[PDB]
Amino acid sequence: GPVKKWECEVISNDNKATFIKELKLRIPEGEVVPFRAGGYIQIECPPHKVAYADFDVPDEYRSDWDKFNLFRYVSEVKEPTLRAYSMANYPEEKGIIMLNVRIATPPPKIPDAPPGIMSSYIWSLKPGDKVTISGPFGEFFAKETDAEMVFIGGGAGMAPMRSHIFDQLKRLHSTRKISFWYGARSLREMFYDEEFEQLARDNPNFTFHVALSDPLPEDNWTGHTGFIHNVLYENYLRDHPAPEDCEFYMCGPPVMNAAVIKMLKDLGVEDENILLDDF
């Protein structure tokens, strides 16, 4: 049973943070990609050569791209390849597949390594380009219980976080207690926050919190600071009567995943109540 494919057209490919783009694809009209929240597709690329200098990076992120000389990078692949990306839209957002794609630059200590293949290709895409996706696939799925849900996200982990949370509130009309905790470095790295604030106004059982590890003075930030595992503990789990009765859904960078899961285990949360997507 061959995997299904769709040739989609790029609607938009906008930065949402210094190093994350929202790639929004139009599904062919009259077609459906029958995915579940937390699920993903694979993208393919043809052979290509792309220059970071040709990327469309909005001006508020350019001084950091210039600082790290990122516009000098070039990426070339001579054979097609495939990679997985998680849906940021939820299943009732029809007609589109929306992705959050981190640019996978070379390691700081090995700066002359090749850039990441598929993320560099994706950042080269412009409105009207065509891309082939396949699947959908999934395993990062919500448990269907009445337990309280705690979503913890970082970086491009925002995509399955958004999909799950909108799926619970808008498709399932869930009455469960749900909260979302997102760690980012500074205010310009935060996105979709207006959507989550509106969901929290409309859904008394839902709350949303951002921690900034290194806010800039000009962020004028009076919110939580530091790492999200500490903020989640200090502002919520420390006087929760039974954190072990919560379901925790984690998708962030590895240093986040490790710190959150360690903090949860220290509280006595069982592995079966911790679901991780480690990209």
Ligand X SMILES: Cc1cc2nc3c(=O)[nH]c(=O)nc-3n(C[C@H](O)[C@H](O)[C@H](O)COP(=O)(O)OP(=O)(O)OC[C@H]3O[C@@H](n4cnc5c(N)ncnc54)[C@H](O)[C@@H]3O)c2cc1C
Q: Which residues bind ligand X (CB under 6 A)?
A: 40, 83-86, 99-102, 104-107, 110, 113-119, 156, 159, 279
Q: Quick one: what does residue 117 bind among ligand F2L, ligand X, none, with the CB cut-off 5 to 8 Å set by partner type?
A: ligand X
Interaction residues for ligand F2L, span 254-273 (CB under 6 A): 255-256, 259
Q: How far is the CB of 97 from ligand F2L (least distance, A)?
A: 25
Given 253, 273, 275, 276, the residue binding ligand F2L (CB under 6 A): 253
Find out whether 165 and 150 touch, Cβ atoms under 8 Å.
Answer: no
Number of residues that bind ligand F2L (CB under 6 A): 12
Q: Which backbone phi and psi does 134 adopt, to 5 degrees?
A: -145, 160
Closest distance to ligand X from the beta carbon of 36 (Å)? 13
Is the separation of the CB atoms in 35 and 135 below 8 Å? Answer: yes
Is the CB of residue 80 less than 8 Å from the CB of residue 47? yes
Name the nearest CA neighbour of 23 among 83, 107, 74, 105: 83
Closest to ligand F2L by CB, 42 vs 257, is 257
CB 219 within 8 A of CB 185: no
Question: Would you say 77 or 259 has its CB closer to ligand F2L?
Answer: 259
* Pairing label, strands 20-26, 96-102: antiparallel
Q: Does 199 contact ligand F2L by CB under 6 A?
A: no
Residue 138: name its binding partner from ligand F2L, ligand X, none (Cβ under 5 to 8 Å by kind). none
User: Cβ closer to ligand F2L: 163 or 257?
Assistant: 257
Q: ∠ CA 222-197-180 to the nearest 5 degrees? A: 85
253 binds, among ligand X, ligand F2L, none (CB under 5 to 8 A by kind): ligand F2L
Instruction: Output the smallest distance, CB 95 to ligand F2L, in A.
Output: 32
Closest residue to ligand F2L: CB criterion: 213
Nearest-angstrom CA–CA distance, 151 and 163? 11
Instruction: Identify the CA nearest to 38 among candidates 173, 136, 175.
Output: 136
DSSP labels for 74-111?
A: EEEESS-EEEEEEBSS-TTSTTEEEEEEE--PPPTTST
Residue 39 CB, nearest approach to ligand X (Å): 9
- Read off φ and ψ for residue 12, nearest 5 degrees: -155, 160
223: which DSSP letter?
A: S
Q: How many residues can be counted in the chain?
A: 279
Shortest spacing between CB 43 and ligand X, in angstroms: 9
Residue with Cβ nearer ligand F2L (167 or 189): 189
Rounded to a whole number of angstroms, the minimum distance from the CB of residue 202 to ligand X is 26
Binding-site ranges for ligand F2L (CB under 6 A): 154, 183-185, 213, 227-228, 252-253, 255-256, 259
